[PDB]
From Swiss-Prot:
<comment type="similarity">
    <text>Belongs to the heat shock protein 90 family.</text>
</comment>
<feature type="binding site">
    <location>
        <position position="129"/>
    </location>
    <ligand>
        <name>ATP</name>
    </ligand>
</feature>
<feature type="binding site">
    <location>
        <position position="42"/>
    </location>
    <ligand>
        <name>ATP</name>
    </ligand>
</feature>
<comment type="function">
    <text>Molecular chaperone that promotes the maturation, structural maintenance and proper regulation of specific target proteins involved for instance in cell cycle control and signal transduction. Undergoes a functional cycle that is linked to its ATPase activity which is essential for its chaperone activity. This cycle probably induces conformational changes in the client proteins, thereby causing their activation. Interacts dynamically with various co-chaperones that modulate its substrate recognition, ATPase cycle and chaperone function.</text>
</comment>
<comment type="subunit">
    <text>(Microbial infection) Interacts with herpes simplex virus 1 protein US11; this interaction inhibits TBK1-induced interferon production.</text>
</comment>
<feature type="region of interest" description="Interaction with NR3C1">
    <location>
        <begin position="1"/>
        <end position="216"/>
    </location>
</feature>
<feature type="binding site">
    <location>
        <position position="103"/>
    </location>
    <ligand>
        <name>ATP</name>
    </ligand>
</feature>
<feature type="modified residue" description="N6-acetyllysine">
    <location>
        <position position="49"/>
    </location>
</feature>
<comment type="subunit">
    <text>Homodimer. Identified in NR3C1/GCR steroid receptor-chaperone complexes formed at least by NR3C1, HSP90AA1 and a variety of proteins containing TPR repeats such as FKBP4, FKBP5, PPID, PPP5C or STIP1. Forms a complex containing HSP90AA1, TSC1 and TSC2; TSC1 is required to recruit TCS2 to the complex. The closed form interacts (via the middle domain and TPR repeat-binding motif) with co-chaperone TSC1 (via C-terminus). Interacts with TOM34. Interacts with TERT; the interaction, together with PTGES3, is required for correct assembly and stabilization of the TERT holoenzyme complex.</text>
</comment>
<feature type="modified residue" description="N6-acetyllysine">
    <location>
        <position position="75"/>
    </location>
</feature>
<feature type="binding site">
    <location>
        <position position="84"/>
    </location>
    <ligand>
        <name>ATP</name>
    </ligand>
</feature>
<protein>
    <recommendedName>
        <fullName>Heat shock protein HSP 90-alpha</fullName>
    </recommendedName>
</protein>
<comment type="function">
    <text>(Microbial infection) Seems to interfere with N.meningitidis NadA-mediated invasion of human cells. Decreasing HSP90 levels increases adhesion and entry of E.coli expressing NadA into human Chang cells; increasing its levels leads to decreased adhesion and invasion.</text>
</comment>
Length: 217
């Protein structure tokens, strides 16, 4: 008689990814705003991909033709969400690409930081997503790929993440990254702050970026 039942899988992060997450979430950096640039960059890449695929197969856009990025601060939940209508991910994609397999860039980036590089370089190593943990204590990724169901990935950087089917609100296609912000990082929920960060770092993104200020009445 339960309203809902669903299987949740828990996976351990590959060792080097766990190491990087611990470094990022614990260490003091003075330029934490770069997380938003990195997430918008990932969305832009995902939008390029579905767009590329649609060139040879227009039906790839039956799940939605609009290619855009939405930013949604919710002060009541203390969350900031970045949403795109890009290519999205399968369950295998989440497990493979968000924790269990480390590319060489993970170790390389930590090496670069030890050698004196700046965290703002993180995107060049292909792991910019994890910069989310500069400002977030927990990150949830909800994703929908063509021909696949909607999944939710989640981690609070304990060395493990979970994956499950998401049945809440169906997306047409794309990815939502939900940042559950640290208590002292709530400035990134303010309109002025989000606007100035986008203006400074995401000028050359070639998709509409739209702010939706969320408040439950
Ligand atoms: C390249 O690495 C990553 C990419 C993504 C991603 C994938 C897709 C399809 N879209 C968006 N916005 N982001 C994520 Cl959620 C984590 C990592 Cl680690």
């Amino acid at each position: 008689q339960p309203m809902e039942e669903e299987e949740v899988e828990t996976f351990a992060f590959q060792a080097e990814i766990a190491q990087l997450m611990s470094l990022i979430i614990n260490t003091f950096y003075s330029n934490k705003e770069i997380f938003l640039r990195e997430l918008i960059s990932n969305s832009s890449d995902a939008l390029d991909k579905i767009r590329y695929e649609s060139l040879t197969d227009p039906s790839k856009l039956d799940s939605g033709k609009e290619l855009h990025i939405n930013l949604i601060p919710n002060k009541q939940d203390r969350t900031l969400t970045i949403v795109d209508t890009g290519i999205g991910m399968t369950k295998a994609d989440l497990i493979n690409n968000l924790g269990t397999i480390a590319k060489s860039g993970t170790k390389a980036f930590m090496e670069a930081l030890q050698a004196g590089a700046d965290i703002s370089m993180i995107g060049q190593f292909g792991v910019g997503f994890y910069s989310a943990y500069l400002v977030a204590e927990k990150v949830t990724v909800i994703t929908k790929h063509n021909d696949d169901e909607q999944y939710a990935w989640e981690s609070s950087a304990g060395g493990s993440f979970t994956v499950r089917t998401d049945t809440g609100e169906p997306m047409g296609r794309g990815t939502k990254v939900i940042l559950h912000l640290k208590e002292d990082q709530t400035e990134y929920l303010e309109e002025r702050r989000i606007k100035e960060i986008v203006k400074k770092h995401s000028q050359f993104i070639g998709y509409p970026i739209t702010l939706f200020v969320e408040k439950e009445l």
